[PDB]
Each structure stands twice: as C-alpha cells, then as structure tokens.
Design a protein around this nucleic acid. Structure first.
Length: 73
DNA sequence: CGATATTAAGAGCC
DNA sequence: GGCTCAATATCG
C-alpha cells in the first residue's frame, strides 16, 4: 500500500520505552513531561546504536512504501 | 477521521 | 525550499 506513516528519529524510538521508565518514578506524567525529561536524558545518551538501528530499519520500509506512492499517484 | 501538547534526526512532497 | 513525520490520552 501507498501513503506511509513516515519514519521516526532514534529519539522517538527510545522515548517510547523511556515513557514507561519515567511513569515508574512520576505518576502524573503522560507524554509532554516525558518529552522534557527526554530532552535532558537523550543529551546524556552516548552509544545510541540500538535506537539508530531501529529508526534506520523504519527508514528502509518507509522508502519501500514511498515507492508505491509513486506507482499509485 | 482531525485537533490539542512536547521533543528529536533523517529523507520525502512537488 | 516551506512544510512533513510520531507517541499517548481525550472530544468535536
């Protein structure tokens, strides 16, 4: 199928798991507080190759889905 | 289905 | 070359 949900950053990949880790320490948080805590934690996260490999995988399937967007429009 | 709220890195739309 | 992308939780 055409029209993909676009690819993500290495940040967004980690933020989804960090949301659950931040919920364990702060009960009032949802997503925007996790984005602020996220900014300070990602600044200190060297060797981010897990997060970079997962977003690079999403970029390859995005390029595949985008090829079908030109085949169907 | 589309709009509100916060933060980042990559390659696309036409 | 200005605009595009989630992730989670709710209402028009």
């Amino acid at each position: 199928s055409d029209k993909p949900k676009r690819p993500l950053s290495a940040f967004m990949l980690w933020l989804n798991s960090a949301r659950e880790s931040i919920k364990r320490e702060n009960p009032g948080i949802k997503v925007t507080e996790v984005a602020k805590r996220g900014g300070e934690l990602w600044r200190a996260m060297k060797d981010k190759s897990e997060w970079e490999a997962k977003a690079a995988k999403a970029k390859d399937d995005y390029d595949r889905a985008v090829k079908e967007f030109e085949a169907n429009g």
